[PDB]
Scaffold this active site. Structure first.
Site, PDB file in Angstrom:
ATOM      1  CB  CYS A 173       9.479  25.983 124.088  1.00  0.00           C
ATOM      2  SG  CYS A 173       9.446  26.342 125.833  1.00  0.00           S
ATOM      3  CB  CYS A 203      12.694  23.601 126.953  1.00  0.00           C
ATOM      4  SG  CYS A 203      11.293  22.879 126.137  1.00  0.00           S
ATOM      5  CG  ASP A 207     -22.373  28.642 126.099  1.00  0.00           C
ATOM      6  OD1 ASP A 207     -22.362  29.290 127.158  1.00  0.00           O
ATOM      7  OD2 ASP A 207     -21.451  28.695 125.238  1.00  0.00           O
ATOM      8  CB  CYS A 213       9.708  23.451 129.876  1.00  0.00           C
ATOM      9  SG  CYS A 213       9.221  24.893 128.928  1.00  0.00           S
ATOM     10  CB  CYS A 245       6.322  24.091 126.473  1.00  0.00           C
ATOM     11  SG  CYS A 245       7.659  22.977 126.013  1.00  0.00           S
TER      12      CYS A 245
HETATM   13 ZN   LIG Z   1       9.419  24.199 126.721  1.00  0.00          ZN
END
Ligand SMILES: [Zn+2]
Ligand SMILES: Nc1ncnc2c1ncn2[C@@H]1O[C@H](COP(=O)(O)OP(=O)(O)NP(=O)(O)O)[C@@H](O)[C@H]1O
Ligand SMILES: [Mg+2]
Lengths: 398, 256
Positions: free
Chosen positions: A186, A189, A314, A167, A164
């Site tokens: 989220c 939040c 790689d 947050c 997020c």
């Molecule tokens: Zn959040």
């Protein structure tokens, strides 16, 4: 020419300029957008495939003599080029890590570029959480997939960019297409995907070689598999709708222009029908596997891994690809090939697929002979860049 | 916490191993999550049913629930966020380690078991502080290239690819995972690479290490099974379950 900045300030004045930028799909989105707008507005000025820096852009205006330009622009060049150009519309396809590599740096580049034309609208992929991470000065509209939602789930643990931005908790998805794209939310939040202005509301029929879908009440069909072509279609249709082009003109333009997506690469080895697919990164390879998983027939799977300059030295990235999908596919037998035939065979054994049905070949020629003598009518070949060139070259000798 | 990976339900197994894939959805870079797939593969060959759980930020960790902890590497941002969550798992991870239970830690995961690491730009990020090693930064330089080390306790050679700015120094109560034959290793001053402390195995090796070194994959899984079921059990031999991988293994004859 250092004076390419002086040509652009001069020649770009007399155009309504659309800029397409982002990590991936810039070329294909630009081409389809040009195809659709041409149907409504006639000749459209656009840059050749990948000529998306100051030189390629300047040359494009130099070949032209109240008109629309749709330009592919390299993310890194955008802040500079928009101190010379004043675009009316920005299209953001997506933001992913450069694989070689900080997503917020390449993002800040395109935010700075648009910031230089603060009145231009941004049409962004609402499915990308990055495109809701920052207060933006420009007006923003969003396109994305608004299909059936499920309860919030974590994206696959190998997915990048799932924190997020408000947050620093881990985002979940009511819908996930690929990578970190979808109806993100989220649980800690308020942050979640914004209301979409342009909606893909139905996936009608998705196959190993095609897709049909509904965008804002109209049906579209493309003759290539894979979700990424549906996003490129969604982006171009969204631009046409923003320009007020009629449904009938979008359909006519779409159908005449969709050949710019190309077709799956098909040929025969004896009586077998074969498809060759380039793999180079975890998300790409995982999307190739999800596409061929849809096939309604049994097939052989050949995986060709080289580690040359042009492939990238790689090969550790195969360990992040979702090869575990092969245990949920109608696969008759597996060929492990290329110079790294040993590492790719180990990568496929570790899925838990029957190891008696995984066979190494030291030479691509032996892969071709194995496919010619196989029981199943269909063969899929997933190959790194140089394995694909050698494979096509050996086919040409017949 | 959720289960990311499970052995097929319809096959029989005499043992059960549960793996904690620590921050497996944030420390997920450089194919290092391939180590999970190698542990599952080797465990199944030894008769163990495998469960892998993603135990990430805000997830409780109970040391009694797990037989192997895998802690891999991530990008600098994801690693700084993981570092904010570590104190919440410190007591249970210290107890896990003190009980001689098996940990494999790679790059950032190896650094975060120790006191702290410092980013290239000088910012110090505190680690779990459960082990005594610490990691200094390099302003501009990185250690990059092929590496080969030899562990003299087990007489085992490991091969990989290193790519780190971090310069790790081991405390007096630790051993290295191995001594450098060629490459940089932990700090380019001593000949140490990684850490071996009780049943903690740490490295800077990409590969992934257990894909390139089935000797270590076998060692981690057998060690976990003998800790769980006791040292008197009889497991299939290295040569019997990994004959093909042993035959095909990359190895060279360079000395030092
Ligand atoms: Zn959040
Ligand atoms: N929407 C998409 N999301 C993710 N990957 C995509 C998408 N569209 C295309 N790709 C992949 O990117 C490749 C290049 O497509 P293109 O439209 O040329 O992208 P680009 O942004 O122009 N980047 P590039 O040409 O590689 O510098 C395709 O062949 C796909 O492998
Ligand atoms: Mg392109």
């Amino acid at each position: 020419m250092a004076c390419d900045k002086d040509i652009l300030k001069d020649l770009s004045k007399d155009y309504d300029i659309v800029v397409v930028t982002g990590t991936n799909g810039k070329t294909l989105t630009t081409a389809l957008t040009v195809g659709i707008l041409k149907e409504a507005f006639g000749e459209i000025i656009t840059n050749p495939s990948g000529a998306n820096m100051i030189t390629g852009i300047t040359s494009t205006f130099l070949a032209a003599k109240r008109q629309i330009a749709v330009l592919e622009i390299d993310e890194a060049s955008l802040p500079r080029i928009t101190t010379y150009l004043k675009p009316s519309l920005f299209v953001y396809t997506n933001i992913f890590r450069d694989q070689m590599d900080e997503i917020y740096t390449t993002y800040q580049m395109i935010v700075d570029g648009a910031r230089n034309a603060p009145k231009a609208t941004i049409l962004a992929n609402g499915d990308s959480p990055i495109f809701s991470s920052k207060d933006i000065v420009n007006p923003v509209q969003y396109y994305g997939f608004d299909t059936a939602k499920h309860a919030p789930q974590l994206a696959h643990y190998n997915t990048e960019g799932i924190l997020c931005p408000k947050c620093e908790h881990i985002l979940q998805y009511r819908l996930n297409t690929y990578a970190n794209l979808g109806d993100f939310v989220c649980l800690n939040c308020q942050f979640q995907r914004p209301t979409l202005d342009y909606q893909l509301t139905e996936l009608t029929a998705i196959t190993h070689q095609s897709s049909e879908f509904v965008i804002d009440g109209q049906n579209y069909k493309i003759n290539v598999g894979g979700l990424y072509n549906i996003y490129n279609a969604l982006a171009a249709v969204s631009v046409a709708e923003f320009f007020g082009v009629s449904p009938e003109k979008i359909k006519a333009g779409f159908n005449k222009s969709k050949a710019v997506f190309g077709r799956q690469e098909t040929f025969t080895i004896g009586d077998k029908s074969c498809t060759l697919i380039l793999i180079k990164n975890p998300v790409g390879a995982s999307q190739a596997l999800e596409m061929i998983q849809l096939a309604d027939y049994p097939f052989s799977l050949s995986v060709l891994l080289n580690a040359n300059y042009a492939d990238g030295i790689d090969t550790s990235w195969i360990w992040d690809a979702n090869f575990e999908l092969i245990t949920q596919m109608p696969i008759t037998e597996i060929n492990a090939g290329g110079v790294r035939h040993s590492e790719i065979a180990r990568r496929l054994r570790v899925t838990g697929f029957d190891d008696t049905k995984i066979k190494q070949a030291e030479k691509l020629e032996q892969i071709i002979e194995t496919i010619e003598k196989q029981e199943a009518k269909h063969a899929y070949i997933l190959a790194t860049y140089t394995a694909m060139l050698e494979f096509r070259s050996l086919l040409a000798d017949r | 916490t959720y289960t990311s990976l499970k052995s097929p339900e319809n096959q029989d197994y005499i043992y059960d191993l549960t793996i904690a894939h620590l921050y497996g959805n944030l420390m997920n870079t450089y194919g290092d999550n391939g180590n999970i797939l190698m542990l599952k593969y080797v465990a199944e060959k030894l008769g163990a049913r495998v469960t892998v759980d993603i135990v990430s930020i805000n997830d409780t960790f109970e040391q009694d629930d797990y037989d192997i902890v895998f802690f891999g590497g991530g990008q600098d941002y994801e690693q700084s966020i993981v570092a904010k969550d570590l104190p919440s798992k410190k007591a249970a991870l210290a107890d896990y380690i003190a009980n001689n239970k098996v940990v494999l830690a790679i790059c950032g995961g190896f650094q975060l078991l120790g006191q702290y690491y410092v980013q290239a730009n000088g910012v110090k990020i505190d680690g779990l502080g459960i082990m005594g090693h610490y990691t200094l930064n390099q302003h501009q330089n990185r250690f990059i290239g092929d590496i080969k080390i030899h562990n003299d306790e087990f007489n085992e050679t490991y091969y990989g690819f290193e790519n780190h700015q971090g310069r790790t120094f081991l405390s007096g109560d630790e051993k290295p995972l191995g001594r450098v034959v060629y490459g940089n290793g932990n700090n380019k001053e001593d000949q140490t690479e990684g850490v071996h402390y009780k049943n903690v195995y740490g490295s800077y090796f990409h590969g992934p290490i257990l894909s390139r070194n089935v000797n270590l994959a076998y060692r981690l899984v057998t060690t976990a099974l003998k800790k769980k079921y006791g040292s008197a059990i009889s497991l299939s031999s290295y040569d019997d379950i990994l004959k093909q991988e042993i035959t095909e293994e990359y190895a060279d004859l360079k000395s030092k």
